[PDB]
């Protein structure tokens, strides 16, 4: 980074302006679709053989059809009775 800064600093036009945007992304994981990652591998493996092209294409195909498990569940209580109980993920809609 230190060497790459010096180059991209002194590269700028004299009598001009060089501005550094201190940057950061948001929802990075939530926005990037797996089908883009699938299309990425195909273009990278263009010259490589058909078996390897198919090998590289699987992991993005899985992530494209992934199913997310929902942790433990939801503990429900009554403060008067002093009782507790975990409602598990399948029983989330077995209760009003």
């Amino acid at each position: 980074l230190s060497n790459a800064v010096a180059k991209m600093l002194s590269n700028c036009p004299p009598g001009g302006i060089s501005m550094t945007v201190t940057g950061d992304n948001t929802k990075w994981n939530e926005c990037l679709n797996p089908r883009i990652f699938l299309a990425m591998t195909e273009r990278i493996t263009r010259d490589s053989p058909i078996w390897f092209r198919d090998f590289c294409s699987i992991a993005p195909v899985l992530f494209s059809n992934k199913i997310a498990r929902l942790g433990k569940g939801f503990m429900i209580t009554s403060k008067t009775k002093r009782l507790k109980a975990q409602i598990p993920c399948p029983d989330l809609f077995s209760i009003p």
Partner: peptide, 9 residues
């Protein structure tokens, strides 16, 4: 797996 690849388009 191929059918999964066909829907992941």
């Amino acid at each position: 797996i191929s059918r999964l690849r066909d829907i992941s388009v």
